[PDB]
């Protein structure tokens, strides 16, 4: 047997004739699967696509003319269907355009964006529909809206791209750009937080809190913060238009669903009636509300107060009743991951969050670390593209209403039923949504009325520079903590935590300023780009023994709280919850039960002494980080996430599997490293800073960018003339097809102190070898 093979004949045959079915390197495509899948999820998939859901939740914005209790004629402009075309050209009958032409022309590779407006009048009296082109929207290569989507390597070569061209990037002004993946708080999970900044937020502020980052079905997010004041009252927080507002928690608790106060007492305090801490804090809260707001005795009155309080900041229409605008803000701010028609579930989740806040302030649960990988997810970049597009079409829909308002206030008459008037106004506004998206790609700046729940503004897209193929493939696996942490002094954010085992590469990190903040995924790490079928999971859970969350009336860490994506499914004892988690894992790994997708991340937190807040947490959404691992019972592949991993024992190799201690084992230890960190020979014999230096330096080598260089017009390109394959190489050198892109040369190296001209770090090159073309490049 031979440990490795050069595969010379196979490689040369494949060079001669590119495959006509599929590329021979499947792993080289799963590397860019996050970016491609994120851009794909906004046009295809269930529910019509992310852009369609985004327009649906943008809804209608109305205005009144004022012409003669009767506010005038109502105009409600909106969009209900958005489509992107694969890029065409008129050079009549159009012809397909491929990115080679965009590269050669030094221009962008963009497809036309079409929105069909709804010019509704008088709530359905008559509707004027007209599709409007809104500029050429840039699209990423190898996506379902790109013309290379299904081509074989043979067809890719015929269309001048590459033998194994990968997408995941855009082309703007003849320059390739990539939306970096950012790592943000885990969605739809309330995590206890201790922050001295919360105390700084004013006076009577503790440092405790409960922060949940709810995500809408169209992948937009809303952060709700549940502060605790030292007196005893709990404060709700949210941000709407780059400003921040505060609300008593009891206001929202009563506004959500028609409920009593004994129900709030039972929801926050379960069977723990004898718990003086909880009872006294809750009495303080209830009496503080009944003192401050004695004229809000029912849900309708509370909603009307909220509506009166929120008029000019929410751009509520003159027709909107106070009750309905209060319902609008309640459905548009509070726990948006449950969406509308989920007031009861939002009520349960707020009660759970309040009890968790009281546990955090009583020191019965430890604070959840927000910078630990256990409590994080990835913002894919295609999702950010969809969110920015939704914000831009919202701005457009508001700008056309601004135009008609300016017409109204300039003294000109109108007719909302007139297609001529609709045409006249639609040509006085800005419809280069595509040009604004191109601006975002070409600068990185995020021009926004809402910060999209994100912290930074600039620094969102980097050029996918192609010095070298390691550099190029590294662009598509780098994840950033955010530019806020770039200028800081808390070194603890850069620490290599054990919570990233198998998700973040321990080695691949740039040295210097971006050390610790710029990370790379382990090469077998996968970021999900779709929601797993979870409709049947609550049904299976009730059969397993989960008592339903509607008629059980339990609360506290004394019981396990079963949740699914932030929705309290039911309550169960801790032992039975452990059994439920084990049985769910078994049924999920064995592919018999149709209601348990293998991507399901059953993150179970056992009871402990002042540890993390317990309960059984189930996740199946987008943006999760998942890695394969061998489930030991029935010996099949399993999928785990960072949240689930910090509690499960996973033997690194099968030799040290212990009795009744391990339920998992890695497929191989080498799948906790990046591609670059796997390509280092005998990495486990060097000092780790030298492995980090190698990851940094292998992206800077004058290797081979690609083979279609006669069809590119890049600003600067470095090409090694004659590369060679390594004699000593990892088994994954072939799996990613790195032989297609040679990076160096096998050299005869004498470790000798002979010359005198190489002492500190210099090295000597043979003159004759140099004259024979050793290490030549252009």
């Amino acid at each position: 047997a031979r440990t490795a093979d050069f595969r010379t004949l196979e490689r040369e045959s494949r060079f001669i004739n590119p495959p006509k079915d599929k590329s021979a390197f499947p792993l080289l495509q799963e590397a860019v699967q996050p970016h491609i899948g994120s851009f794909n999820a906004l046009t295809e998939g269930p529910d019509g696509g992310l852009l369609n859901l985004g327009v649906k939740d943008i809804g209608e914005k109305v205005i009144f003319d004022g012409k003669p209790g009767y506010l005038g004629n109502k105009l409600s402009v909106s969009v209900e269907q958005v489509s992107i075309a694969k890029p065409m050209s008129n050079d009549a009958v159009e012809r397909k355009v491929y990115p080679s032409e965009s590269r050669q022309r030094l221009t962008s590779y963009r497809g036309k964006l079409l929105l069909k407006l709804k010019w509704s009048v008088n709530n359905g009296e008559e509707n004027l529909f007209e599709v409007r082109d809104c500029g050429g929207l840039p699209v990423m290569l190898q996506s379902n809206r790109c013309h290379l989507n299904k081509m074989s390597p043979y067809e890719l070569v015929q269309h001048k791209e590459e033998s194994d061209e990968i997408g995941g990037y855009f082309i703007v002004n003849g320059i390739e750009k990539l939306i970096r993946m950012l790592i943000v708080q885990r969605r739809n999970h309330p995590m206890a937080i201790i922050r001295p900044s919360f105390a700084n937020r004013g006076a009577s502020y503790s440092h405790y809190g409960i922060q949940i980052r709810s995500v809408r079905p169209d992948q937009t997010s809303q952060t709700n913060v549940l502060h605790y004041l030292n007196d005893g009252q709990v404060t709700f927080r949210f941000s709407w238009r780059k400003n921040e507002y505060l609300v008593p928690v009891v206001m929202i608790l009563k506004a959500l669903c028609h409920t009593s106060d004994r129900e709030i007492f039972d929801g926050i305090i379960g069977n723990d009636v004898k718990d003086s801490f909880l009872t006294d804090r809750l009495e303080l809260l209830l009496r503080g509300f009944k003192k401050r707001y004695p004229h809000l005795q029912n849900r309708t009155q509370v909603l009307q107060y909220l509506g009166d309080k929120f008029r000019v900041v929410f751009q509520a229409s003159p027709d909107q009743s106070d009750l309905e605008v209060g319902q609008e803000v309640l459905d548009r701010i509070v726990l948006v991951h449950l969406g509308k028609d989920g007031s009861q579930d939002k009520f349960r989740m707020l009660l759970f969050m309040i009890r968790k806040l009281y546990s955090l302030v009583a020191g019965e649960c430890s604070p959840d670390n927000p910078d630990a990988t256990q409590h994080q997810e990835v913002l894919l970049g295609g999702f950010l593209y969809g969110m920015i597009l939704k914000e831009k079409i919202d701005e457009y829909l508001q700008n056309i209403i601004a135009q008609v308002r300016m017409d109204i206030n300039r003294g000109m008459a109108i007719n909302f039923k007139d297609k001529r008037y609709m045409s006249r106004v639609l040509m006085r506004v800005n419809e280069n949504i595509g040009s604004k998206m191109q601006y975002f790609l070409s600068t990185g700046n995020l021009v926004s009325q809402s910060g999209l729940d994100l912290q930074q503004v600039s620094g969102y897209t980097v050029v996918a520079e192609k010095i070298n193929f390691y550099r190029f493939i590294s662009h598509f696996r780098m994840v950033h903590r955010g530019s806020f942490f770039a200028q800081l002094k808390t070194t603890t954010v850069r620490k290599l935590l054990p919570e990233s085992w198998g998700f973040l590469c321990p080695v691949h990190t740039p040295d210097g300023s971006p050390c610790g903040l710029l990370n790379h995924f382990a090469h077998k790490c996968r970021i999900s780009t779709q929601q797993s079928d979870v409709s049947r999971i609550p049904s299976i859970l009730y059969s397993l023994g989960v008592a339903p969350a509607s008629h059980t009336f339990a609360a506290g860490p004394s019981l396990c709280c079963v949740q699914i994506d932030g929705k309290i499914i039911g309550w169960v004892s801790h032992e039975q919850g452990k059994i439920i988690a084990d049985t769910l894992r078994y049924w999920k790994v064995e592919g018999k039960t149709p209601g348990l997708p293998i991507d399901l991340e059953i993150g179970y937190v056992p009871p402990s002494t002042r540890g993390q807040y317990p309960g059984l947490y189930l996740f199946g959404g987008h943006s999760r980080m998942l890695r394969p691992v061998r489930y030991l019972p029935l010996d099949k592949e399993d999928i785990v996430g960072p949240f689930e991993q910090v509690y499960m024992n996973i033997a690194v190799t099968p030799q040290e599997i212990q009795n009744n201690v391990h339920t998992h084992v890695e497929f191989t230890p080498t799948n906790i490293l990046s591609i670059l960190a796997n390509l280092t020979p005998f990495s486990d014999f060097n000092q780790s800073p030298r492995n980090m230096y190698q990851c940094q330096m292998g992206k800077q080598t004058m290797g081979t960018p690609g083979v279609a260089l006669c069809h590119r017009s890049d600003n600067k390109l470095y090409r090694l003339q004659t590369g060679q394959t390594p004699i000593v190489k990892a088994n994954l050198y072939d799996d990613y097809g790195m032989d297609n892109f040679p990076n160096g040369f096998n050299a005869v190296v004498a470790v000798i102190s002979y010359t005198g001209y190489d002492m500190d770090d210099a090295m000597i090159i043979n003159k004759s070898a140099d004259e024979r073309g050793f290490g030549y490049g252009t």
């Binding site: 009593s260 007492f265 009495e283 005795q297 020191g363």
Partner: protein, 65 residues
């Protein structure tokens, strides 16, 4: 109804008013518009104890280990 220092109506489940906070012999439910008497609510007692993480000291460390 009565839980420590808290009393809830048995009809609408609304928190009442504390007895010694309003006009005499009549504590009124703000939802049910019912009338409750100051009787049978003799002592709303709550017994609390300190956190046991509240007083870090040299002697407290020696208490356990």
């Amino acid at each position: 109804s009565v839980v420590g220092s808290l009393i809830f109506c048995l009809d609408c489940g609304d928190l009442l008013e504390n007895p010694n906070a309003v006009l005499g012999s009549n504590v009124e439910c703000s939802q049910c518009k019912a009338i409750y008497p100051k009787s049978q609510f003799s002592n709303l007692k709550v017994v609390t104890t300190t956190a046991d993480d509240a007083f870090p000291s040299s002697l407290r460390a020696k208490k356990s280990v």
